[PDB]
Design a protein around this ligand. Structure first.
Ligand SMILES: *[C@@H]1O[C@H](CO)[C@@H](O[C@@H]2O[C@H](CO)[C@@H](O[C@@H]3O[C@H](CO)[C@@H](O)[C@H](O)[C@@H]3O)[C@H](O)[C@H]2NC(C)=O)[C@H](O)[C@H]1NC(C)=O
Ligand SMILES: *[C@@H]1O[C@H](CO)[C@@H](O[C@@H]2O[C@H](CO)[C@@H](O[C@@H]3O[C@H](CO)[C@@H](O)[C@H](O)[C@@H]3O)[C@H](O)[C@H]2NC(C)=O)[C@H](O)[C@H]1NC(C)=O
Ligand SMILES: *[C@@H]1O[C@H](CO)[C@@H](O[C@@H]2O[C@H](CO)[C@@H](O[C@@H]3O[C@H](CO)[C@@H](O)[C@H](O)[C@@H]3O)[C@H](O)[C@H]2NC(C)=O)[C@H](O)[C@H]1NC(C)=O
Ligand SMILES: *[C@@H]1O[C@H](CO)[C@@H](O[C@@H]2O[C@H](CO)[C@@H](O[C@@H]3O[C@H](CO)[C@@H](O)[C@H](O)[C@@H]3O)[C@H](O)[C@H]2NC(C)=O)[C@H](O)[C@H]1NC(C)=O
Ligand SMILES: *[C@@H]1O[C@H](CO)[C@@H](O[C@@H]2O[C@H](CO)[C@@H](O)[C@H](O)[C@H]2NC(C)=O)[C@H](O)[C@H]1NC(C)=O
Ligand SMILES: *[C@@H]1O[C@H](CO)[C@@H](O[C@@H]2O[C@H](CO)[C@@H](O)[C@H](O)[C@H]2NC(C)=O)[C@H](O)[C@H]1NC(C)=O
Ligand SMILES: *[C@@H]1O[C@H](CO)[C@@H](O)[C@H](O)[C@H]1NC(C)=O
Ligand SMILES: *[C@@H]1O[C@H](CO)[C@@H](O)[C@H](O)[C@H]1NC(C)=O
Lengths: 92, 104, 92, 104, 92, 92
C-alpha cells in the first residue's frame, strides 16, 4: 500500500545533540528509528548524542562501527524515548 | 554547523539587471550551507548513496569527500522583464528559491 | 484558488487573449496574488499586463493595487485578494 | 577541475557488512566531485537557482559560497542480505549508484 | 523485458509465492539479470531464493549460473539472459 | 506543446575550453546558446573559452558582467559555430 522507506512519521525520539528547529521539549517526530551515539572526539573530552533517524539507509547506520578511526557505538531502538535512558560505553 | 537552509535576499538592483527587470526588484533566494557528518538525522534529508559515501569517508577521509549540503526542494518565481525590443514579458522562472535542504 | 483579470496588449503576438478572467494556479501551501502593470506618460494611462502572480513578499496582505515605485518606466502593483486587478494608483 | 562523475567501487568486505550481505560483495557507487564556476555549461547540468547563487558569489565571494557538484540521477541496486533471524531477504535499495552529476 | 524463475522458501512468512515465473521490471537503458541463491551442506542442496536482479557488474554476459565463491554460507550466482535460473553449479 | 526550457537539442556549439566527454571534433550538441568568454585570470596571462549553454538560466548568463572582481565578456549567439570565429576584447 505504501513503501516502508516513505513511511508516515509516527515514532518519537529524544533530543540532546542533533536537535531540530521545531522539536518541542526535546522530542523529534520521526518514522525510522531512535539512535544514541557515544562518540568521543579525538581530545579526551567525551561527547553524547541522542536523536531520530530517517529510516532510509539506517541498515548501514545501525550496525557497529566496522573499521573507523575513532570508536563509536550506535544503538538503534524503535521504542518511544528509548534513547532517553541510554548510556553506552565504548568497548576496548 | 549543520545542513541548514540559510536566508539570503538578492536584489537585482546590485546585480546589474535593474534596466530589464520591472518587478520584483529583489527576491529571497535562500542559499544552502552547512556540513554533513555521520550520522545523517531525520531532518538532514539524506539518500542511501549519501549515507554510503559518508560511511566510506570514515575509513578513507582523503580518497572520498563528504556529501554536500544541497537543496532538495525549489520553487518558481514570477518575473516581469523587458525584452530586446522593449517588450514587457512575464515568465515563471522555475527553481529559483530554496524551500528545503539535505545531504547529497 | 484565486482569480484575477487577465489583460495583455500583445495578444496578437503570442496568439493569446487580450482580456478575460484568469483562474490562478499555483503550488500548494503557497499564496497567490494578482498583478497590474501599465505605462504612464504625462497623464496618459496605457495598461500593458494584468494577471496572476506567484508568492511574493512585496504584496503581503494588500487589498489594493498601489504602485510604490518613484517614476519607473512601467508602473507595477501587486495585490493579494480576489479581483483586486480592477483599479490602480501611483501613490508612492 | 570541473563537475564530473568520478568512479568509485566500494566493497562491503572492507565495510564490515560481509557477515550480513550475501551478494553483491561490492558495487560501483560512483562519487560526484569537482567545482562549479561561472559559466555553467550544457553538460554541467544546472538550475536557475544555482546560476543565481554562482552569480551572487561573483560580487560577494565571502557571503555566499559557490554551488556544489552533486548527483542528479541515481539508480537502485538489488541486495540479498541476512536478517536478524538468519533469514535471507532481497531488497532493491533505491538511490545507490550515481548516473549523472550537476551543480546544485 | 527479462523473465526469471521466481522461487522463495519464505513464502508463508511474507504471504508470497513459493515459485512461479517472474517478469523482470527495471529502469530504462539498464540491463536486468537473474539470480539464484541456495544452501549447500555436505552434498545436500536446498534452494532459498531465485528471481530477478538489477544491473550488476558481476554477471556481465554470462549464459549460465556458476557460483565462483569459495565455500560461502549461501551460494549465489548471477546470469544474464532469459530463464537462466534453471540450473546452477559451484565451479570456482 | 513543449516548454522552451526543456527544448530538444539541435544547436551546434564549438569547443575550446569547456569540452565534454563525447564532443566530436570539438562540437557540442546543445539546445540553448553558444557562448565565448574571454576572462583573463588574475595573472597577466589571458584565457579563452567557447562552448554550449543549457538555455535554462542563460538570461542571467548572457548579459555583460554587472559588477564582478575580474573583467569578462560573454557573447551569446544562436548560430551554428558562431563562437568559432570570435575574438572578444575586454573594454576598459
Ligand atoms: C528536510 O526536508 C524537510 C521537509 O521539507 C524540512 O522540514 C521543514 O523544516 C522547516 C524549518 O523548521 C519547517 O518550517 C517550519 O514549520 C513550522 C510550521 O508550523 C514552524 O515551526 C515554522 O513556522 C516553519 O514554517 C517546515 O515545515 C518543514 N517541512 C515539513 C514538511 O515538515 C527540513 O528543513 C529539510 N532539511 C533541511 C536540512 O533543510
Ligand atoms: C500617471 O501620472 C500622472 C502624472 O504624474 C499622475 O497624476 C498624479 O496624480 C496624483 C494622485 O495622487 C497627484 O498627487 C496629488 O495631487 C494633488 C496636488 O496636485 C493632491 O491631492 C496631493 O497632494 C498629491 O500631490 C499628482 O499631483 C498627479 N501628478 C500631476 C503631474 O498632476 C497619475 O496619478 C498617474 N496615474 C497612474 C495610473 O499611475
Ligand atoms: C548532465 O546530465 C547528462 C544527462 O544525464 C549527462 O550526460 C551523460 O554523459 C555521459 C558521459 O559522457 C554519457 O555517457 C557516454 O555516452 C556515450 C554513449 O554513446 C558514450 O560516449 C559513452 O560510452 C558513455 O556511455 C551519457 O550518455 C550522457 N547522457 C546523455 C543522456 O546524453 C552529463 O554527464 C551530466 N553532467 C555531469 C557533470 O555529470
Ligand atoms: C555442493 O557441495 C558439494 C560438496 O562440496 C559439491 O560437490 C562437488 O562437485 C564438484 C563438481 O565440479 C566436484 O569437483 C570435481 O570433482 C571431481 C573429482 O572429485 C572432478 O570432476 C574434478 O576434478 C572436480 O574436483 C567436487 O569434488 C565435489 N565435492 C565433493 C566433496 O565431492 C556440489 O557440487 C555442490 N553443489 C552445489 C549445487 O553447489
Ligand atoms: C480566451 O478567448 C476565448 C476566445 O475568444 C474566450 O472564449 C469566448 O470567446 C468569445 C469570442 O469568441 C468572447 O466573446 C467571450 O467573452 C469568451 N468567453 C466566454 C466565456 O464565452 C475565452 O473565454 C477566453 N479565456 C480563456 C481563459 O480561454
Ligand atoms: C502467484 O500465485 C498465484 C496464486 O497461487 C498464481 O496464480 C495461480 O495459482 C494457482 C493456484 O491457485 C496455481 O496452480 C497456478 O500455477 C498459478 N498460476 C496461473 C498462471 O494460473 C500466480 O500465477 C503466481 N504468480 C504471480 C506472478 O502472481
Ligand atoms: C513542554 O514543556 C513545558 C515546560 O518546559 C511544559 O509546560 C509543557 O507541558 C510541555 N509541552 C509540550 C507540548 O510538550
Ligand atoms: C572528425 O575529424 C576527423 C579527423 O580529425 C575527420 O576525418 C572526420 O571527418 C570528422 N568526423 C566527424 C564525425 O566529425
Amino acid at each position: 500500500t505504501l513503501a516502508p522507506e516513505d513511511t508516515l512519521p509516527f515514532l518519537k525520539c529524544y533530543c540532546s545533540g542533533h536537535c531540530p528547529d521545531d522539536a518541542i521539549n526535546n522530542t523529534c517526530i520521526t518514522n525510522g528509528h531512535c539512535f544514541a551515539i557515544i562518540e568521543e572526539d579525538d581530545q579526551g573530552e567525551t561527547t553524547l548524542a541522542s536523536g531520530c533517524m530517517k529510516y532510509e539507509g539506517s541498515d548501514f547506520q545501525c550496525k557497529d562501527s566496522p573499521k573507523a578511526q575513532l570508536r563509536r557505538t550506535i544503538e538503534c531502538c524503535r521504542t518511544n524515548l528509548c534513547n532517553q535512558y541510554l548510556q553506552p560505553t565504548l568497548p576496548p | 554547523t549543520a545542513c541548514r537552509k540559510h536566508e539570503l535576499y538578492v536584489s537585482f538592483q546590485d546585480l546589474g539587471w535593474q534596466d530589464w527587470i520591472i518587478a520584483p526588484k529583489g527576491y529571497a533566494a535562500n542559499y544552502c550551507d552547512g556540513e554533513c557528518s555521520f550520522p545523517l538525522n531525520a531532518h538532514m534529508n539524506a539518500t542511501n548513496h549519501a549515507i554510503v559515501q559518508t560511511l566510506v569517508h570514515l575509513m578513507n577521509p582523503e580518497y572520498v569527500p563528504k556529501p554536500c549540503c544541497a537543496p532538495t526542494k525549489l520553487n518558481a518565481i514570477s518575473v516581469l522583464y523587458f525584452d530586446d525590443n522593449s517588450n514587457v514579458i512575464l515568465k515563471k522562472y522555475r527553481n529559483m528559491v530554496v524551500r528545503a535542504c539535505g545531504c547529497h | 484558488t484565486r482569480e484575477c483579470i487577465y489583460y495583455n496588449a500583445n495578444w496578437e503576438l503570442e496568439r493569446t487573449n487580450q482580456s478575460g478572467l484568469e483562474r490562478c494556479e499555483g503550488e500548494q501551501d503557497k499564496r497567490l496574488h494578482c498583478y497590474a502593470s501599465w505605462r504612464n506618460s504625462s497623464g496618459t494611462i496605457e495598461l500593458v499586463k494584468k494577471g496572476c502572480w506567484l508568492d511574493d513578499f512585496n504584496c503581503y496582505d494588500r487589498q489594493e493595487c498601489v504602485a510604490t515605485e518613484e517614476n519607473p518606466q512601467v508602473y507595477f502593483c501587486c495585490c493579494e485578494g480576489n479581483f483586486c486587478n480592477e483599479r490602480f494608483t501611483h501613490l508612492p
